[PDB]
């Protein structure tokens, strides 16, 4: 958003192996009002 960066999340248990067919809502956790330009997105991988 222009004034906020809303973040929604949800923790669920495994039913099956990968990507089970079912419905679960995503509860919000925090809304940081940073208001900055965001165009690209990159993730991180932990290396031990």
């Amino acid at each position: 958003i222009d004034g906020y960066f809303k973040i929604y999340s949800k923790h669920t248990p495994i039913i099956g192996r990968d990507f089970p067919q079912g419905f679960s809502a995503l509860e919000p956790l925090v809304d940081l009002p940073i208001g900055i330009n965001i165009t690209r997105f990159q993730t991180l991988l932990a290396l031990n």
């Binding site: 004034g3 009002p33 208001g35």
Partner: protein, 48 residues
């Protein structure tokens, strides 16, 4: 000439020459969501 000059504050000096601590409060206009507000809370639930 040296740009900086020592104040040389002394208690025996007059009020005009006495040191004065000055703090300037600058308020940022609304460009980002407000992060600083004033404390306001009173009253009770008073039900029914």
């Amino acid at each position: 000439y040296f740009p900086l000059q020592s104040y040389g504050f002394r208690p025996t000096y007059g009020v005009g020459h006495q040191p004065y601590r000055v703090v300037v409060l600058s308020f940022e206009l609304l460009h980002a969501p407000a992060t600083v507000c004033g404390p306001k809370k009173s009253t009770n639930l008073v039900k029914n």
